[PDB]
Amino acid sequence: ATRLGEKLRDLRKQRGLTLEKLADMAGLSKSYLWELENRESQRPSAEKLTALADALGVGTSFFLED
Template identity: 60%
Template sequence: MHRVAETLRDRIKTLRKKAKLTLDQLAPQAGLSKSYLWELENRDLPRPSGEKLAGLAKALNVTVDYLLGGDPTENLETAEDKAFFREYEAMSPEARAQLRRLAKALDK
């Protein structure tokens, strides 16, 4: 059985590898430097700022709460769904309509 990541650094590394991203690829997506991201994954640093956590969560398609392990009822799938819905809400009405049509076609 797959071990659930317990710490922030474990969750970041696990999610990055699941997304098949290198540190070089994830860092700009999250608005972080590669060296800072490496330190987050490999050292016990104080908790990053909310802004840094938000950028990282967005780049990894999860919620900040999931990264921090703050909600024991939130699993990876739920966190991904919440992150997707957050992006969906920010889309134009036309893009949302197109995505709904695509979802209906995939469900058939």
């Protein structure tokens, strides 16, 4: 797995959101969000990082720091 993906999946599951729901919320495909959770990936774009962080109640810095 990966650090950004660990963080993203952990917070999503703690917020009670399915993969499909969080992807829909952030305007992402389900496969793209799965890739962020489970594969080495380019950092999400600033708008998508903002959407993901806001959906999960954390700062974008959560994903940008180690």
